[PDB]
Design a protein around this ligand. Structure first.
Ligand SMILES: Cc1ccc(NC(=O)c2ccc(CN3CCN(C)CC3)cc2)cc1Nc1nccc(-c2cccnc2)n1
Ligand SMILES: O=C(NC1=NN(c2ccc(Cl)c(Cl)c2)C[C@@H]1CCO)c1ccncc1
Length: 264
């Protein structure tokens, strides 16, 4: 039992978070600080592996581990709770006059900061998308990884290479050779930017999954969405270079957004 172990009685367990939306994740209260928290429970090797990774990740724009309970079952991983929930539903439901261009820029800047941190620490996300991001008060955004490929119903994830892939977020070299890297996260970030610019539309709208790889290999890319600043679309296209080594680093992306943000 290490530094992160907390006593189970420190947490008040309430209902499943979203009533089952996230699997075995519960809304809780960290009583001594009057804070709402999220609590993932084991309904083992992989569970503890996730906790070990999260002990190494500390950044304002990444979901923050608060503690674990590992002395008796059920095991808990406890994180902060984010008031406004996941970014995809937030974008689809928000007041667009409040969530204007400078706010969307601010959210993209924060996500790129989180990814620059993972890049610096030699982590790979592998499933970056608006559905894996969270929104808090004052337009805070945090990147998370909810393990959605096993949870979500619908066509977001579909069978490929013997697993479940979010095809329309997946870099070509990942689709073709199952090669994942920080550069395939850069590709997914470009799709995430498009989700932000459209307030959460599904990407390649109207295009069947069966066509996506062929179109990408033949240099098709989503056109600039309505109202998207040209400089932001320029960054999108750079994220979608066919060769992973031609894509910018997250350090470069964040620098670009930071410059854009302070000039606004
Ligand atoms: C309760 C919990 C337990 C674990 C996690 N873990 C992560 O979010 C995560 C993030 C990044 C990594 C990094 N990792 C690097 C390696 N690659 C391959 C995978 C990613 C791992 C786990 C989150 C949570 N939090 C969580 N889970 C589900 C829903 C919510 C939630 C929902 C609504 C409002 N507020 C919070 N909050
Ligand atoms: O104008 C539309 N979207 C928009 N994207 N912009 C933007 C700005 C910064 C980033 Cl970083 C990204 Cl990604 C995108 C701004 C603009 C909205 C603000 O005016 C829009 C029109 C019609 N339907 C849906 C959306």
């Amino acid at each position: 039992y290490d530094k992160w172990e907390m006593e189970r009685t420190d947490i008040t367990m309430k209902h499943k978070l979203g009533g089952g939306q996230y699997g075995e994740v519960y809304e809780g209260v960290w009583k001594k600080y009057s804070l709402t928290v999220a609590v993932k429970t084991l309904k083992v090797e992989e569970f503890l592996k996730e906790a070990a990774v999260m002990k190494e990740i500390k950044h304002p724009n990444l979901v923050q581990l608060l503690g674990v309970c590992t002395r008796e079952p059920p095991f808990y991983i406890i994180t902060e709770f984010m008031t406004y929930g996941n970014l995809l539903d937030y974008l689809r439901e928000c007041n667009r006059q409040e969530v204007n261009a400078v706010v969307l820029l601010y959210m993209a800047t924060q996500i790129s900061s989180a990814m620059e941190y993972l890049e610096k620490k030699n982590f790979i996300h592998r499933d970056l998308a608006a559905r894996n991001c969270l929104v808090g008060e004052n337009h805070l955004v945090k990147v998370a990884d909810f393990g959605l490929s096993r949870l979500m119903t619908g066509d977001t994830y579909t069978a490929h290479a013997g697993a479940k892939f979010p095809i329309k977020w997946t870099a070509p070299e990942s689709l073709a050779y199952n090669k994942f890297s920080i550069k395939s996260d850069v590709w997914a970030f470009g799709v995430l930017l498009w989700e932000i610019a459209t307030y959460g539309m599904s990407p390649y709208p109207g295009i069947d999954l069966s066509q996506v790889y062929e179109l990408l290999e033949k240099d098709y890319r989503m056109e600039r969405p309505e109202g998207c600043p040209e400089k932001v679309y320029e960054l999108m296209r750079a994220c979608w270079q066919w060769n992973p080594s031609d894509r910018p680093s997250f350090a470069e992306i964040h620098q670009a957004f930071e410059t854009m943000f302070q000039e606004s």
